Amino acid sequence: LPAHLRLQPIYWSRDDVAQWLKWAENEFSLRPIDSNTFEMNGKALLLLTKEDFRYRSPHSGDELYELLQHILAQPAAGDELKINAACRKVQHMVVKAALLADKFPVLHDIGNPKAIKCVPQADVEWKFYDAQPCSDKAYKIEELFYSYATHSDKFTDGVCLFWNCNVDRYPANSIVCRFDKSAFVNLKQLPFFYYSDSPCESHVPLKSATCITRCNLGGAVCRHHANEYRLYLDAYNMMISAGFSLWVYKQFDTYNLWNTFTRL
Ligand SMILES: CC(C)N(CCCNC(=O)Nc1ccc(C(C)(C)C)cc1)C[C@H]1O[C@@H](n2cc(Br)c3c(N)ncnc32)[C@H](O)[C@@H]1O
Ligand SMILES: [Zn+2]
């Protein structure tokens, strides 16, 4: 199963649907169908009726429809290493952006047992906390079990990071990833964005309001950032498809990221 097909079908692109047809043809010895028989993405494919499938593919449509129902009832397991890398990719993107946007002087990293910074180049005082620190890193980790009822009046400077540290309730100045609502009342959902300050380079166009790059100030994303945006979106989809959700302090504002780009 190609990697994209391990995502829930709602995340499948038009090219993913076409690769699904080819996989299904070989796995089930079906009559070859033109790759454009289902010229749509997975969101659209889920809207078709079984009749629609039969009309589009008289020879294999019913089978394809049932295959889709089985995939929907029994999601495929994702790869732990790819999901690890995806989550780390998102973590670095989101925390890097938050620090650039709001210039927090301190980050309180709660639930980090290894004392590894996700954004090592940030100009910020990084502080680590964990209820069970790794013995080889405890010398620089505060042994602490966070509970809102006990600590809501602490860590009010800077920003708190809870990256899969599933506490009872998060304080208002937090960045959160949680694997699957009262825990989140002080926060808002974090919508998808991509931010990059790497140099633009020119050697399918990308149209998207969520590509926060110097070259998208004028709507003409460079090839380099187009590529990096699509790779980042793939990581983000793999993480959301696997059941993680991202939450953030309510003042988080992507226009603060657009303002990092200046006109000289
Ligand atoms: C960050 C990490 C170390 N640990 C991850 C736990 C959750 N794991 C998880 O959600 N993993 C996962 C989810 C889904 C998948 C797939 C296969 C479905 C994709 C795979 C893995 C948590 C770290 O945080 C520390 N911890 C936990 C609590 Br709760 C806590 C606390 N209250 N105060 C301080 N430290 C705390 C703990 O002591 C501990 O250090
Ligand atoms: Zn660019």
The whole-angstrom separation of Cα 204 and Cα 182 is: 42
Asked if 171 and 110 touch (Cβ cutoff 8 Å), the reply is no
Asked if 162 and 144 touch (Cβ cutoff 8 Å), the reply is no
The whole-angstrom separation of Cα 112 and Cα 15 is: 38
Beta strands in 49-132 (DSSP E): 106-110, 125-130
Q: Is 226 helix (H, G, I), strand (E, B) or coil?
A: helix
The whole-angstrom separation of Cα 203 and Cα 177 is: 35
Q: Find where tokens 């069970």 sit.
A: 132
Residue 113: CB within 6 Å of ligand 1?
yes
The whole-angstrom separation of Cα 97 and Cα 88 is: 14
- The binding site consists of 109-115, 200, 215, 222, 225
Residue 166: CB within 6 Å of ligand 1?
yes
The encoded tokens of residue 160 equal 């708190």
The encoded tokens of residue 105 equal 């002087």
Q: Report the largest interatomic distance among the alpha carbons of the chain, rounded to a whole angstrom.
A: 67
Alpha carbon separation from 220 to 97, 160, 199, 217, 263 (Å, rounded) = 22, 35, 14, 8, 16
Q: Is 246 helix (H, G, I), strand (E, B) or coil?
A: strand
Q: Which amino acid is at 252?
A: F
Give me the resolution in angstroms, 1 decimal: 1.6
Within 8 A by CB and 6+ apart from 181, the residues are: none
User: Residues 114, 116, 117, 118: what is their CA dihedral angle, to the nearest 10 degrees?
Assistant: -90
Residue 150: CB within 6 Å of ligand 1?
no
What experiment produced this structure?
X-ray
Report the half-sphere exposure of 219 (CA within 13 A, side-chain side).
1
Residues measured by CB to lie within 5 Å of ligand 2, the ion: 200, 213, 215, 222, 225
Q: Which helix (H) or strand (E) holds 159?
A: strand 159-163
